[PDB]
Prior knowledge:
Chain B: One of its GO terms (biological process) is bacteriocin immunity. By secondary structure, chain A is mostly beta strands. Chain A contains one helix and five strands; from the N terminus they run αβββββ. Chain A has one helix spanning about 1-5, and strands at about 25, 40-45, 50-55, 60-65, 70-75. In chain A, a hairpin with a 4-residue loop joins β3 and β4 (about 60-65). Chain B has a four-stranded antiparallel β-sheet, with no helix packed on it. Classes of the chains: A mainly beta, B alpha+beta.
Amino acid sequence: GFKDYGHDYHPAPKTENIKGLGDLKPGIPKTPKQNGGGKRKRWTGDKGRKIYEWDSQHGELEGYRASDGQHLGSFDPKTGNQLKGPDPKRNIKKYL
Amino acid sequence: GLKLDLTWFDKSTEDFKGEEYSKDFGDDGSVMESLGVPFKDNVNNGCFDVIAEWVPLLQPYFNHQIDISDNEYFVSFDYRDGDW
């Protein structure tokens, strides 16, 4: 039943509570999941040079370089601290 | 509970122009039922393109006067325990 569905994934942070990455604005969401009809919630920061996307299974922001989509690592929305570092294999270049 | 998280963007520039949450639905998902969005893998898991059909179904829950000829709209189905 429905509450159960609501605990399947980690709720995304509301924009105002994302700390430590500067001023942020939601961006048009474009990255599909394979299971789910949704596109990943998206924010831009640093004049749009940085993109962040909520990953609702791990419960962290994945950060990307807007110019080419390169992955930058993940960040704790409460602090803004880097948690994972860049993964050269990962980018969002087809979803920019 | 469940809030519809509504978000909209300029068709010309894609700039962000607004965000509004519906009131809390508690644990009643039927609004998702009326959109035709299964619960499975869809709660706290992304945003959906607000299509023309969805406007009438959604508008009753928002102050924003949804205008799909002006803006691209997206909704997500956020669920958090309690009041939030």
